[PDB]
Amino acid sequence: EVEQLLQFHVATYMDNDIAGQPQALQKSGRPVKAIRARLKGKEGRLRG
Amino acid sequence: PQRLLIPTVDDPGIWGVKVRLGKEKDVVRQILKKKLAREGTKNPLEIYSAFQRDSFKGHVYIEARKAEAINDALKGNVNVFSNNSKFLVGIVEYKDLLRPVKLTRGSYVRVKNGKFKGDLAQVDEVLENGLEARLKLVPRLDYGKDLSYTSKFRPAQRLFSEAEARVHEIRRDRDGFVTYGGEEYYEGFLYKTFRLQNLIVNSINPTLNELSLF
Amino acid sequence: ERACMLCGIVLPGRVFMQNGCPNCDSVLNLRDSDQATVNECTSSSFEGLVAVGDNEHSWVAKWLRVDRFQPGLYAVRVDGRLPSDIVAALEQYGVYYRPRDG
Amino acid sequence: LIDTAVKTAETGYIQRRLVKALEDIMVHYDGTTRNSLGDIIQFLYGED
Amino acid sequence: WEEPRLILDQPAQHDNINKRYEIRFGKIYLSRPTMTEADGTTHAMFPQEARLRNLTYSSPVYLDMEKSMFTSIDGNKVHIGKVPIMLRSKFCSLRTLDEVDLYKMKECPYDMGGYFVINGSEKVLIAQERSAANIVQVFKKAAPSPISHVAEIRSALEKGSRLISTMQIKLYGREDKGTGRTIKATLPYVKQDIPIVIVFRALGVVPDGEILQHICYDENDWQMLEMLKPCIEEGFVIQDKEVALDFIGRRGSAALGIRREKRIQYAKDILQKELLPHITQEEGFETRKTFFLGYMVNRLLLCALERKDQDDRDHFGKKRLDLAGPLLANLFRILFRKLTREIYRYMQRCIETDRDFNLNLAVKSTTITSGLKYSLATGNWGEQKKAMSSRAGVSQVLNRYTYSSTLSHLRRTNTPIGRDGKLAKPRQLHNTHWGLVCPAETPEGQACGLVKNLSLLSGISIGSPSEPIINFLEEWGMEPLEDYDPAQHTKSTRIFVNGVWTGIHRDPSML
Amino acid sequence: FGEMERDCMIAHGAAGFLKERLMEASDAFRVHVCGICGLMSVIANLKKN
RNA sequence: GCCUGGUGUCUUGGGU
DNA sequence: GGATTACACCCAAGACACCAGGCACGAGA
DNA sequence: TCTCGTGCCTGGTGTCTTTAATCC
Ligand SMILES: [Zn+2]
Ligand SMILES: [Zn+2]
């Protein structure tokens, strides 16, 4: 249970849009802004 | 000898069960109530014991002979995850589940509470009963400067200066020992009692600043 | 709640004052004590809560050496040790104290 | 009003894909029309 | 009164002494809005002070609670929170006063109210458009699907008016593809589609001849009868009630291993409740659900036989507007359960001490007060921790740029379909909008055609009890459902009251 | 200066103008790279040279 | 006696 | 039976962690 | 003067069950 949780945190640190499992959440309730989400979409590093 | 009490294949099985974090003690309690309430009836709860280890968050362990008894023990318990998540423990793993586990005068500890939270302190002595320890601490004082404290609005650390106290705001008790605002300072250090549970004795890392001082 | 240092049982502290320890009070006499005595033989600090339902057939109970005691809540680890004067008095009674603090 | 408001985004997407498909295509000094890989798209621009 | 009592129990063996702890919620009382200073002093709050000092214009709500203590060897006015008051309503301190004294309270007589004040900011609730409950709608399905026609209904109770469940009946089989063209249904909390005949048998009507007598009311219609042919044969081997009910329970999202002796009794709950709960939920009334089920299948086949067009989703008679009243009740319902569980979780610790709880220490008014304030201030319709998936924009800052804009803003309606999904059907001005929503007033841009505005003479139904209507229908000749046979009644008219088939009458013209 | 304005300057063939807009007139930055491994791992003290 | 830092993430309403 | 796609720019107003445990201070006996 | 209760501040840690088309 503890090793899988280290795998989990390292995964959602890089990509928090993994299909088929719940997103990592901030205490405010909104999803964590992972590095992958920083680069994609209209406002990310590349298009924005 | 403890070695004669090791478990064997003749002993009941132990299952682990996942429960809501922080609710492990409650589940152990609830299991005991159910067991005692059903003793001697036509439908006894066929578990022997249940327990929860702090080191093992989110789990309760339950001793029985049949898996069905585990389901029976937990039925209706609002603190237990409904998924059929129980797991079997090996006989060779049993005793480690029940392993029960410092502090010496002259050694260093880190304080865990109050304005001295995080500060390094020397253990001077412990109470006869065995609960609180007298600590030697670099004080964080103001000499009553703005009187008519918290850890976020405290003072810098500096050895007690009795002549500064004499000038600005004090009871002499012995050679180098003063009581100032109802605390004791000997040769510049505060000597104050803390609960042993309020100090950290393990894995202390002295800081740069502490290496410079001590 | 406090835990008896001798037998490890967990009870509300006032119980130790009202009725004594249900396992130990024949030798510990907490029922007829003051609060200072109760607090020297029972601890507010303990870890590993154990429901023992069947003392005499539980392996868990045998390991914790509570197999001859009454069904109830027990602690795996009880912090503190009996005062040396009480240990000495128990030994006068043929009772051997095995500390439960680890 | 609905049509103008809806189909403006349809054609806006069309223009974006067209530009990215064609942005690197340049006339070179030998008259050929090539992309950034030097692939020949036309041997002579516009055939004239 | 939706969940009127809390109940605990312990079988005292510690001389068994069952001690049920019970708490009953009674009458509600309301007080006028009151400002309580840090001092402790109180006074009547009027809106002008509330705007200036960024306060919330709200009324304290008190609830009677009653304790009772069953013991078997074998309170008063507790404060539950503050509810924001709509200005100029019956519970606002401005409703009285009279024109002379309005000027002294700095209130303008042209201000018609209809809005709330939350932290000094004026918030108006926007009417939310939704589909009607308790009505059957038939739609056609796209080509790459084995289904060609679907009947759908979302069932919602009359009391409260709240959603419960949703149910579908799908007709499989494409055009000359799909072989056996049978019909299966979808039931709440069951993982797989179940053929129609099986659920008919599972309700207590098992021989074929009675089943077809409940659906088709025209023995000559061989086209319709031919389409029900494969449904009989694919559910032939299930020949009695018991094996039918068990076939259901073996799919309904439960645990593994509840045996036939009980897996029936779990499925009987999924049939009695959750399946069409708007008709009835008391026992021994399964004749109404069986008759209604036959009606659905009949409607399904009429569309598949091209004798009736598929329903028009934009027909305004199939639509409802949720205004301030219904919207607050749904939110208040969610929050009152949250307050309830915090009371229940608190009793299990405070009774292990065996100390009489002072009640006022077991009602935290922050649950309702912060809940209503947060949702009205942000528009996030739900619990704060679940801000996504919840609907946004229900509350908006009242536009005060000009007087005309205030009138329009208080009469606005919203359809919550999105910006995802292009097409045109929810955006078009449909013919049935005539006289009910404005044909001209609509925003430019992304909301165009989805946000609408009520025509000048429109009104919204407040709601009325259906019970007096039933009494009027039976007094003037309506005949019960147990007396009805398609051979005898081959021509009478069916009567619906709020979507439940309640009777039949042979001479509708006089009625 | 969005994506569509970028394309217009390409069509004009004003390559020099486009470079300046997106660098000198904005967020131009100087980095050091290692000629061997190509990474921006250089530690550069400019007063000690 | 030169240097001189004031937020973010959303949502909603608008403009062409 | 799975995601990815869904014009551009701009303006402005309107918002923000919860629960439990421990320690300290004040009041009452 | 001592003990108990209440309030405030700081630190640690989640969970009752409840929009639509296309292509690969
Ligand atoms: Zn004992
Ligand atoms: Zn290098």
Side-chain angles (χ1 to χ4, degrees), chain E residues 485-507:
Chain E
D485 166 45
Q488 190 71 19
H489 304 92
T490 175
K491 196 190 300 179
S492 307
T493 289
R494 302 183 285 250
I495 296 183
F496 297 92
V497 174
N498 292 326
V500 45
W501 193 47
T502 64
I504 30 83
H505 202 291
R506 295 183 161 277
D507 187 19

PDB file of all heavy atoms in Angstrom, chain E residues 485-507:
ATOM      1  N   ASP E 485     -61.153  -3.805 -19.140  1.00  0.00           N
ATOM      2  CA  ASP E 485     -60.853  -4.887 -20.061  1.00  0.00           C
ATOM      3  C   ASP E 485     -60.878  -4.365 -21.488  1.00  0.00           C
ATOM      4  O   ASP E 485     -61.869  -3.726 -21.873  1.00  0.00           O
ATOM      5  CB  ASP E 485     -61.910  -5.985 -19.868  1.00  0.00           C
ATOM      6  CG  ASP E 485     -61.919  -7.006 -20.989  1.00  0.00           C
ATOM      7  OD1 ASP E 485     -60.839  -7.468 -21.403  1.00  0.00           O
ATOM      8  OD2 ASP E 485     -63.025  -7.332 -21.478  1.00  0.00           O
ATOM      9  N   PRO E 486     -59.825  -4.576 -22.285  1.00  0.00           N
ATOM     10  CA  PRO E 486     -59.861  -4.072 -23.672  1.00  0.00           C
ATOM     11  C   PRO E 486     -60.970  -4.676 -24.524  1.00  0.00           C
ATOM     12  O   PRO E 486     -61.381  -4.041 -25.505  1.00  0.00           O
ATOM     13  CB  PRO E 486     -58.481  -4.452 -24.222  1.00  0.00           C
ATOM     14  CG  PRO E 486     -57.988  -5.538 -23.323  1.00  0.00           C
ATOM     15  CD  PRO E 486     -58.553  -5.232 -21.969  1.00  0.00           C
ATOM     16  N   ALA E 487     -61.447  -5.889 -24.216  1.00  0.00           N
ATOM     17  CA  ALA E 487     -62.569  -6.421 -24.985  1.00  0.00           C
ATOM     18  C   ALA E 487     -63.850  -5.652 -24.673  1.00  0.00           C
ATOM     19  O   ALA E 487     -64.642  -5.362 -25.576  1.00  0.00           O
ATOM     20  CB  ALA E 487     -62.749  -7.912 -24.708  1.00  0.00           C
ATOM     21  N   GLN E 488     -64.085  -5.335 -23.392  1.00  0.00           N
ATOM     22  CA  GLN E 488     -65.250  -4.533 -23.032  1.00  0.00           C
ATOM     23  C   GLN E 488     -65.020  -3.053 -23.295  1.00  0.00           C
ATOM     24  O   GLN E 488     -65.896  -2.363 -23.828  1.00  0.00           O
ATOM     25  CB  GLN E 488     -65.606  -4.748 -21.560  1.00  0.00           C
ATOM     26  CG  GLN E 488     -66.946  -4.157 -21.145  1.00  0.00           C
ATOM     27  CD  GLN E 488     -68.146  -4.901 -21.703  1.00  0.00           C
ATOM     28  OE1 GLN E 488     -68.043  -6.054 -22.116  1.00  0.00           O
ATOM     29  NE2 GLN E 488     -69.290  -4.229 -21.735  1.00  0.00           N
ATOM     30  N   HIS E 489     -63.830  -2.562 -22.958  1.00  0.00           N
ATOM     31  CA  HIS E 489     -63.448  -1.175 -23.185  1.00  0.00           C
ATOM     32  C   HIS E 489     -62.544  -1.072 -24.405  1.00  0.00           C
ATOM     33  O   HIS E 489     -61.329  -0.895 -24.313  1.00  0.00           O
ATOM     34  CB  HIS E 489     -62.762  -0.596 -21.957  1.00  0.00           C
ATOM     35  CG  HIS E 489     -63.557  -0.694 -20.697  1.00  0.00           C
ATOM     36  ND1 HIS E 489     -63.448  -1.756 -19.827  1.00  0.00           N
ATOM     37  CD2 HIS E 489     -64.440   0.164 -20.136  1.00  0.00           C
ATOM     38  CE1 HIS E 489     -64.254  -1.559 -18.797  1.00  0.00           C
ATOM     39  NE2 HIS E 489     -64.861  -0.398 -18.958  1.00  0.00           N
ATOM     40  N   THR E 490     -63.155  -1.197 -25.560  1.00  0.00           N
ATOM     41  CA  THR E 490     -62.406  -1.068 -26.792  1.00  0.00           C
ATOM     42  C   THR E 490     -62.446   0.357 -27.321  1.00  0.00           C
ATOM     43  O   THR E 490     -61.835   0.642 -28.356  1.00  0.00           O
ATOM     44  CB  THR E 490     -62.953  -2.046 -27.838  1.00  0.00           C
ATOM     45  OG1 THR E 490     -62.286  -1.845 -29.090  1.00  0.00           O
ATOM     46  CG2 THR E 490     -64.449  -1.840 -28.018  1.00  0.00           C
ATOM     47  N   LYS E 491     -63.137   1.257 -26.620  1.00  0.00           N
ATOM     48  CA  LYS E 491     -63.306   2.615 -27.110  1.00  0.00           C
ATOM     49  C   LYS E 491     -63.169   3.717 -26.055  1.00  0.00           C
ATOM     50  O   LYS E 491     -63.074   4.886 -26.440  1.00  0.00           O
ATOM     51  CB  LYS E 491     -64.695   2.683 -27.767  1.00  0.00           C
ATOM     52  CG  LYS E 491     -64.993   3.836 -28.680  1.00  0.00           C
ATOM     53  CD  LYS E 491     -66.455   3.860 -29.021  1.00  0.00           C
ATOM     54  CE  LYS E 491     -66.917   2.602 -29.724  1.00  0.00           C
ATOM     55  NZ  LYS E 491     -68.378   2.678 -30.008  1.00  0.00           N
ATOM     56  N   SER E 492     -63.050   3.406 -24.764  1.00  0.00           N
ATOM     57  CA  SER E 492     -63.055   4.464 -23.759  1.00  0.00           C
ATOM     58  C   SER E 492     -61.718   5.206 -23.698  1.00  0.00           C
ATOM     59  O   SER E 492     -60.679   4.721 -24.146  1.00  0.00           O
ATOM     60  CB  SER E 492     -63.409   3.906 -22.385  1.00  0.00           C
ATOM     61  OG  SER E 492     -64.623   3.181 -22.443  1.00  0.00           O
ATOM     62  N   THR E 493     -61.766   6.390 -23.093  1.00  0.00           N
ATOM     63  CA  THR E 493     -60.626   7.291 -22.982  1.00  0.00           C
ATOM     64  C   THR E 493     -59.907   7.099 -21.653  1.00  0.00           C
ATOM     65  O   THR E 493     -60.542   7.046 -20.598  1.00  0.00           O
ATOM     66  CB  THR E 493     -61.117   8.731 -23.142  1.00  0.00           C
ATOM     67  OG1 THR E 493     -61.494   8.943 -24.503  1.00  0.00           O
ATOM     68  CG2 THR E 493     -60.050   9.745 -22.789  1.00  0.00           C
ATOM     69  N   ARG E 494     -58.580   7.023 -21.716  1.00  0.00           N
ATOM     70  CA  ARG E 494     -57.715   6.996 -20.550  1.00  0.00           C
ATOM     71  C   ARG E 494     -57.516   8.372 -19.937  1.00  0.00           C
ATOM     72  O   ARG E 494     -57.443   9.375 -20.646  1.00  0.00           O
ATOM     73  CB  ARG E 494     -56.360   6.425 -20.938  1.00  0.00           C
ATOM     74  CG  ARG E 494     -56.454   5.058 -21.520  1.00  0.00           C
ATOM     75  CD  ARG E 494     -55.096   4.520 -21.807  1.00  0.00           C
ATOM     76  NE  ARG E 494     -54.540   5.142 -22.988  1.00  0.00           N
ATOM     77  CZ  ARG E 494     -54.359   4.506 -24.131  1.00  0.00           C
ATOM     78  NH1 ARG E 494     -54.678   3.228 -24.229  1.00  0.00           N
ATOM     79  NH2 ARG E 494     -53.847   5.143 -25.169  1.00  0.00           N
ATOM     80  N   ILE E 495     -57.439   8.411 -18.607  1.00  0.00           N
ATOM     81  CA  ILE E 495     -57.363   9.653 -17.844  1.00  0.00           C
ATOM     82  C   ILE E 495     -56.071   9.669 -17.046  1.00  0.00           C
ATOM     83  O   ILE E 495     -55.825   8.764 -16.242  1.00  0.00           O
ATOM     84  CB  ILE E 495     -58.565   9.808 -16.909  1.00  0.00           C
ATOM     85  CG1 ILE E 495     -59.846   9.912 -17.723  1.00  0.00           C
ATOM     86  CG2 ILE E 495     -58.390  11.005 -16.019  1.00  0.00           C
ATOM     87  CD1 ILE E 495     -61.075  10.141 -16.894  1.00  0.00           C
ATOM     88  N   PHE E 496     -55.266  10.705 -17.233  1.00  0.00           N
ATOM     89  CA  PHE E 496     -54.008  10.884 -16.522  1.00  0.00           C
ATOM     90  C   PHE E 496     -54.069  12.114 -15.631  1.00  0.00           C
ATOM     91  O   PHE E 496     -54.568  13.162 -16.042  1.00  0.00           O
ATOM     92  CB  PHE E 496     -52.815  11.057 -17.460  1.00  0.00           C
ATOM     93  CG  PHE E 496     -52.525   9.879 -18.327  1.00  0.00           C
ATOM     94  CD1 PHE E 496     -53.062   9.770 -19.587  1.00  0.00           C
ATOM     95  CD2 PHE E 496     -51.656   8.905 -17.889  1.00  0.00           C
ATOM     96  CE1 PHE E 496     -52.759   8.693 -20.384  1.00  0.00           C
ATOM     97  CE2 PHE E 496     -51.353   7.829 -18.675  1.00  0.00           C
ATOM     98  CZ  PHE E 496     -51.906   7.723 -19.926  1.00  0.00           C
ATOM     99  N   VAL E 497     -53.552  11.985 -14.411  1.00  0.00           N
ATOM    100  CA  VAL E 497     -53.432  13.086 -13.460  1.00  0.00           C
ATOM    101  C   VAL E 497     -51.979  13.105 -13.023  1.00  0.00           C
ATOM    102  O   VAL E 497     -51.554  12.212 -12.293  1.00  0.00           O
ATOM    103  CB  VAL E 497     -54.348  12.909 -12.248  1.00  0.00           C
ATOM    104  CG1 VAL E 497     -54.081  13.987 -11.229  1.00  0.00           C
ATOM    105  CG2 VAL E 497     -55.785  12.918 -12.663  1.00  0.00           C
ATOM    106  N   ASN E 498     -51.221  14.097 -13.491  1.00  0.00           N
ATOM    107  CA  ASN E 498     -49.776  14.244 -13.242  1.00  0.00           C
ATOM    108  C   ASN E 498     -48.988  13.040 -13.741  1.00  0.00           C
ATOM    109  O   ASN E 498     -48.021  12.611 -13.117  1.00  0.00           O
ATOM    110  CB  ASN E 498     -49.447  14.491 -11.768  1.00  0.00           C
ATOM    111  CG  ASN E 498     -49.926  15.815 -11.280  1.00  0.00           C
ATOM    112  OD1 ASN E 498     -49.935  16.792 -12.021  1.00  0.00           O
ATOM    113  ND2 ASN E 498     -50.314  15.869 -10.020  1.00  0.00           N
ATOM    114  N   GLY E 499     -49.385  12.502 -14.882  1.00  0.00           N
ATOM    115  CA  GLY E 499     -48.637  11.448 -15.527  1.00  0.00           C
ATOM    116  C   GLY E 499     -48.890  10.034 -15.050  1.00  0.00           C
ATOM    117  O   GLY E 499     -48.376   9.098 -15.672  1.00  0.00           O
ATOM    118  N   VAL E 500     -49.669   9.814 -13.997  1.00  0.00           N
ATOM    119  CA  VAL E 500     -50.007   8.457 -13.589  1.00  0.00           C
ATOM    120  C   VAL E 500     -51.398   8.145 -14.118  1.00  0.00           C
ATOM    121  O   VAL E 500     -52.333   8.930 -13.941  1.00  0.00           O
ATOM    122  CB  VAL E 500     -49.888   8.261 -12.066  1.00  0.00           C
ATOM    123  CG1 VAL E 500     -50.503   9.377 -11.296  1.00  0.00           C
ATOM    124  CG2 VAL E 500     -50.530   6.964 -11.648  1.00  0.00           C
ATOM    125  N   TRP E 501     -51.514   7.032 -14.828  1.00  0.00           N
ATOM    126  CA  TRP E 501     -52.793   6.498 -15.263  1.00  0.00           C
ATOM    127  C   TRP E 501     -53.665   6.123 -14.077  1.00  0.00           C
ATOM    128  O   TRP E 501     -53.346   5.171 -13.364  1.00  0.00           O
ATOM    129  CB  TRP E 501     -52.547   5.310 -16.187  1.00  0.00           C
ATOM    130  CG  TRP E 501     -53.737   4.900 -16.901  1.00  0.00           C
ATOM    131  CD1 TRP E 501     -54.588   5.712 -17.551  1.00  0.00           C
ATOM    132  CD2 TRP E 501     -54.175   3.569 -17.167  1.00  0.00           C
ATOM    133  NE1 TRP E 501     -55.578   4.989 -18.141  1.00  0.00           N
ATOM    134  CE2 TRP E 501     -55.339   3.664 -17.935  1.00  0.00           C
ATOM    135  CE3 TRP E 501     -53.714   2.311 -16.804  1.00  0.00           C
ATOM    136  CZ2 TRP E 501     -56.054   2.557 -18.353  1.00  0.00           C
ATOM    137  CZ3 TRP E 501     -54.427   1.207 -17.219  1.00  0.00           C
ATOM    138  CH2 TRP E 501     -55.582   1.338 -17.983  1.00  0.00           C
ATOM    139  N   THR E 502     -54.752   6.858 -13.831  1.00  0.00           N
ATOM    140  CA  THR E 502     -55.544   6.632 -12.630  1.00  0.00           C
ATOM    141  C   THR E 502     -56.935   6.084 -12.896  1.00  0.00           C
ATOM    142  O   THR E 502     -57.618   5.720 -11.938  1.00  0.00           O
ATOM    143  CB  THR E 502     -55.698   7.909 -11.806  1.00  0.00           C
ATOM    144  OG1 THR E 502     -56.425   8.874 -12.565  1.00  0.00           O
ATOM    145  CG2 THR E 502     -54.351   8.460 -11.420  1.00  0.00           C
ATOM    146  N   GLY E 503     -57.405   6.066 -14.134  1.00  0.00           N
ATOM    147  CA  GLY E 503     -58.763   5.606 -14.357  1.00  0.00           C
ATOM    148  C   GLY E 503     -59.124   5.661 -15.822  1.00  0.00           C
ATOM    149  O   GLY E 503     -58.296   5.970 -16.681  1.00  0.00           O
ATOM    150  N   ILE E 504     -60.381   5.324 -16.094  1.00  0.00           N
ATOM    151  CA  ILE E 504     -60.941   5.345 -17.441  1.00  0.00           C
ATOM    152  C   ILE E 504     -62.372   5.858 -17.375  1.00  0.00           C
ATOM    153  O   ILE E 504     -63.086   5.609 -16.399  1.00  0.00           O
ATOM    154  CB  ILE E 504     -60.836   3.974 -18.133  1.00  0.00           C
ATOM    155  CG1 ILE E 504     -60.885   2.824 -17.139  1.00  0.00           C
ATOM    156  CG2 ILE E 504     -59.548   3.874 -18.893  1.00  0.00           C
ATOM    157  CD1 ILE E 504     -62.249   2.424 -16.738  1.00  0.00           C
ATOM    158  N   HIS E 505     -62.786   6.595 -18.399  1.00  0.00           N
ATOM    159  CA  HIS E 505     -64.147   7.109 -18.482  1.00  0.00           C
ATOM    160  C   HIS E 505     -64.664   6.862 -19.887  1.00  0.00           C
ATOM    161  O   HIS E 505     -63.926   6.999 -20.863  1.00  0.00           O
ATOM    162  CB  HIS E 505     -64.271   8.591 -18.137  1.00  0.00           C
ATOM    163  CG  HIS E 505     -65.653   8.987 -17.711  1.00  0.00           C
ATOM    164  ND1 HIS E 505     -66.722   9.018 -18.581  1.00  0.00           N
ATOM    165  CD2 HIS E 505     -66.143   9.357 -16.507  1.00  0.00           C
ATOM    166  CE1 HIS E 505     -67.810   9.388 -17.930  1.00  0.00           C
ATOM    167  NE2 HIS E 505     -67.486   9.600 -16.671  1.00  0.00           N
ATOM    168  N   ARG E 506     -65.925   6.459 -19.966  1.00  0.00           N
ATOM    169  CA  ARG E 506     -66.535   6.019 -21.207  1.00  0.00           C
ATOM    170  C   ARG E 506     -67.178   7.139 -22.012  1.00  0.00           C
ATOM    171  O   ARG E 506     -67.272   7.027 -23.237  1.00  0.00           O
ATOM    172  CB  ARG E 506     -67.650   5.052 -20.825  1.00  0.00           C
ATOM    173  CG  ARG E 506     -67.195   3.770 -20.176  1.00  0.00           C
ATOM    174  CD  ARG E 506     -68.396   2.887 -19.917  1.00  0.00           C
ATOM    175  NE  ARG E 506     -68.053   1.487 -19.704  1.00  0.00           N
ATOM    176  CZ  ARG E 506     -67.833   0.607 -20.670  1.00  0.00           C
ATOM    177  NH1 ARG E 506     -67.923   0.966 -21.945  1.00  0.00           N
ATOM    178  NH2 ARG E 506     -67.538  -0.644 -20.355  1.00  0.00           N
ATOM    179  N   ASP E 507     -67.584   8.227 -21.350  1.00  0.00           N
ATOM    180  CA  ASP E 507     -68.184   9.415 -21.962  1.00  0.00           C
ATOM    181  C   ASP E 507     -67.361  10.641 -21.592  1.00  0.00           C
ATOM    182  O   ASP E 507     -67.727  11.386 -20.672  1.00  0.00           O
ATOM    183  CB  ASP E 507     -69.637   9.590 -21.530  1.00  0.00           C
ATOM    184  CG  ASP E 507     -70.338  10.707 -22.277  1.00  0.00           C
ATOM    185  OD1 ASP E 507     -69.847  11.114 -23.351  1.00  0.00           O
ATOM    186  OD2 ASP E 507     -71.378  11.189 -21.786  1.00  0.00           O
TER     187      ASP E 507
END
